[PDB]
Design a protein around this ligand. Structure first.
Ligand SMILES: O=c1ccn([C@@H]2O[C@H](COP(=O)(O)OP(=O)(O)O)[C@@H](O)[C@H]2O)c(=O)[nH]1
Lengths: 14, 695
């Protein structure tokens, strides 16, 4: 969120 | 010339797979001729692939000195710094590479990737297009660009884009090169299930290749439970023990395991982030092991095997922070995919995927490399009852009876209502209603003036938009709020007299067909708005343009900023109905919306990711919200928006069943998980290879 953070699921690097 | 032949020999032994001899030979080349740019650049690449990044850096530094026009070395060194998490350094290197050779397609793509990974999608999009200008045939850049376009809902030439993606993957699989579409993204594009599984398998193979060079023998696995005093040793491996959706789902599970029959080991792949989520899992697991401190996958796998793990649980799959090499080493006799990754690992080292009959019907077992292992209701779970107990009950203020215009929630809400004279109780538990009098005016005045909180009869009444200013830990879901919180349509600019259809997912889950479905629904329900999130903000103007092209005025769609965790879940109470994305459902997001008591309409597809919401709804006991095709999805959505008595009945069902069904019951979930674990174990103990556990 603006001013903070909202972690989400995301892909690993490749 | 002798240095030349030495470098040649090194290359050969390298291709053979003998990396140690290759290194020995590159070094011999350097010994003979120290200023050999190619030997340095080759040895650097090799070291980089071995995960010896600091060492690779030394040689990249040599190469760039010797050959100052060596753009390739700058670019490659950039890749190494990126892997070392030196983001500025890597960018500096890509920038130099493009300055040295402006025609260098790869370097633009790598620079685009830094912009992407940093969230700056438009600059990412700009650099990928430049790459593709330079090199039209460039799978990595095309596919990475496609994902950027997905994130911001840019659907220019979408159908041809989707066809090209499929064609690119077909060609790469055929020519045995690592596909440019990431397995975690493969559900977004119309690839066959065969292709999606094959992409996953290619990633699994990457892990196997990495661990094969450790030349470790297979591990001897326990054959019974005698050394563990009759207890099954279960290891949960995750990079997400901390502030992350994964912990928001399962943080209560380790401490709910029955210690008489299970011994729980949590293997963290991430350092401690200081949050209560990490505190909780560290406090409640029988054992907590910080593998972030053990970078070597060989030493880390040794650690897991030494602990005597019977069932090792992969909570990452192909997501950030994963170390699937640990599973490729097979330190445990049974390894299962669970919860974190919504697709197949495609990998031989994974035995099971924990799922259910709604998510993964036996008919589609072919989509998975793993054997199916069914939980009896849904495999999905969430920690909402523990994190957000203040949302178990609600009261409303009648400001003219609506249940979602002006809402109160709090641990002490009953006591507050009891201090109030003229409260009416509408039967559904029950919904108390506060009349539009003095107390109710003071509340709306707070909201209108942007005031943070007020006091009424000694009770703390908080503006729901201001939680970070009142208690930041309550805002993120690390603590239960200790004040009474007010949530209202006016806080978000939502119409007081219309039906609100919401969807709080990241925008990448929406596609043209989905938005068209939504547009059709809005057109059929005059007094209605669609409520979406700036997730990210740069997606907003793309959605709006497509909506306008569909004949929807700007005011049919309302955007809100992404909010802190607690506010996000709490404001779901303001919606009438959630319209789930068919391409990739709400998963965590679906649980969030249901905890608010908001009916979600879904159309399950064929992939795991497209069927999760229907599984949640089925467990919940709301079969009527599951559509078999687009027309039924629209008809269901429109009936909820227009038959107000039906709407009331359905919302009432959701509201009651989030408690009375198994959906949010973490104790029941843990116990069913335990039953499944024992099935897996008895099967293996009797000397059988994994088979479907579909009771
Ligand atoms: O305004 C919002 C919208 C979402 N979320 C959270 O953001 C995360 C989204 O993660 P992801 O995309 O992986 O969700 P999923 O695909 O599982 O639904 C979830 O934890 C939501 O609870 C949030 O905190 N505030």
């Amino acid at each position: 969120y603006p001013g903070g953070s909202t972690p989400v699921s995301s892909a690993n690097m490749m | 010339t002798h240095a030349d032949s030495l470098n040649n020999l090194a290359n050969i032994k390298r291709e053979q797979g003998n990396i140690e001899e290759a290194v020995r030979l590159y070094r011999k080349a350097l010994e003979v001729f120290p200023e050999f740019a190619a030997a340095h650049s080759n040895l650097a690449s090799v070291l980089q692939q071995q995960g010896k990044l600091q060492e690779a850096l030394m040689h990249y530094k040599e190469a760039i000195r010797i050959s100052p026009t060596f753009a390739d070395a700058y670019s490659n060194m950039g890749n190494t710094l990126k892997e070392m998490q030196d983001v500025q350094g890597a960018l500096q290197c890509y920038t130099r590479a493009i300055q040295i050779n402006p025609a260098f397609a790869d370097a633009h793509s790598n620079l685009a990737s830094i912009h992407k990974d940093s969230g700056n999608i438009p600059e990412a999009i700009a650099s990928y297009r430049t790459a593709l200008k330079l090199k039209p045939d460039f799978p990595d850049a095309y596919c990475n660009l496609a994902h950027c376009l997905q994130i911001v809902c840019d659907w220019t030439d979408y159908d041809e884009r989707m066809k090209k993606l499929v064609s690119i993957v077909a060609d790469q699989l055929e020519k045995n090169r690592l596909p440019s579409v990431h397995p975690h993204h493969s559900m977004l594009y119309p690839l066959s299930h065969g292709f999606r599984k094959a992409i996953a398998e290619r990633h699994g193979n990457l892990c196997l290749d990495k661990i094969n060079v450790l030349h470790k023998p297979p591990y001897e696995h326990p054959k019974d439970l005698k050394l563990s005093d009759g207890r099954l040793r279960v290891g949960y491996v995750s990079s997400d023990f901390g502030n992350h959706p994964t912990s928001h789902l399962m943080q209560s599970i380790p401490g709910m395991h029955n210690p008489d029959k299970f011994e729980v080991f949590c293997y963290a792949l991430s350092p401690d982030d200081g949050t209560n989520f990490r505190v909780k899992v560290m406090a409640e697991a029988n054992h907590f092991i910080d593998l972030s401190q053990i970078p070597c996958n060989g030493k880390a796998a040794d650690r897991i095997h030494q602990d005597g793990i019977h069932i090792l649980v992969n909570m990452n799959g192909y997501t950030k922070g994963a170390r699937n090499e640990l599973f490729a080493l097979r330190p445990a006799p049974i390894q299962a995919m669970w919860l974190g990754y919504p697709g197949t690992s495609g990998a031989l080292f994974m035995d099971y995927i924990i799922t259910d009959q709604e998510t993964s019907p036996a008919e589609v077992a072919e989509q998975y490399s793993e054997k199916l292992a069914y939980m009896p209701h849904t495999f999905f779970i969430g920690d909402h009852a523990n994190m957000f107990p203040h949302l178990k009950k609600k009261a409303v203020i009648d400001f003219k009876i609506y249940d979602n215009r002006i809402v109160l929630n709090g641990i002490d809400l009953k006591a507050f209502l009891d201090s109030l004279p003229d409260v009416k109780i509408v039967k559904m538990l029950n919904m108390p209603v506060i009349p539009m009098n003095t107390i109710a005016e003071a509340v709306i005045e707070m909201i209108n003036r942007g005031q943070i909180q007020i006091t009424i009869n000694g009770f703390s009444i908080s503006n729901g938009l201001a939680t970070t200013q009142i208690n930041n830990k309550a805002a993120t879901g690390e603590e239960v709020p200790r004040t009474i919180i007010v949530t209202t349509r006016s806080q978000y600019g939502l119409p007081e007299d219309a039906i609100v259809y919401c969807n709080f997912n990241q925008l990448y889950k929406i596609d043209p067909s989905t938005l068209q479905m939504w547009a059709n629904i809005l057109k059929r329900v005059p007094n209605s708005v669609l409520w979406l999130l700036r997730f990210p903000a740069v997606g907003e103007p793309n959605i709006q343009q497509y909506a306008q092209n569909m004949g929807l005025p700007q005011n049919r769609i309302i955007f809100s900023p992404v909010a802190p965790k607690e506010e996000h879940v709490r404001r779901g109470q303001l919606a009438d109905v959630c319209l789930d994305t068919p391409l990739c459902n709400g998963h965590t997001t679906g649980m969030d919306v249901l905890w608010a008591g908001t009916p979600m309409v879904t159309m399950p597809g064929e992939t795991l990711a497209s069927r999760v919401a229907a599984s949640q709804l089925t467990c919940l006991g709301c079969l009527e919200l599951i559509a078999k095709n687009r027309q039924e999805y629209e008809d269901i959505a429109v009936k909820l928006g227009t038959d107000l008595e039906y709407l009331k009945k359905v919302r009432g069902k959701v509201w009651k069943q989030r408690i009375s069904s198994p959906l949010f019951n973490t104790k029941q979930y843990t116990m069913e998980l335990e039953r499944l674990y024992l099935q897996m174990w008895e099967h293996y103990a009797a000397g059988n290879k994994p088979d479907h556990m579909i009771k």
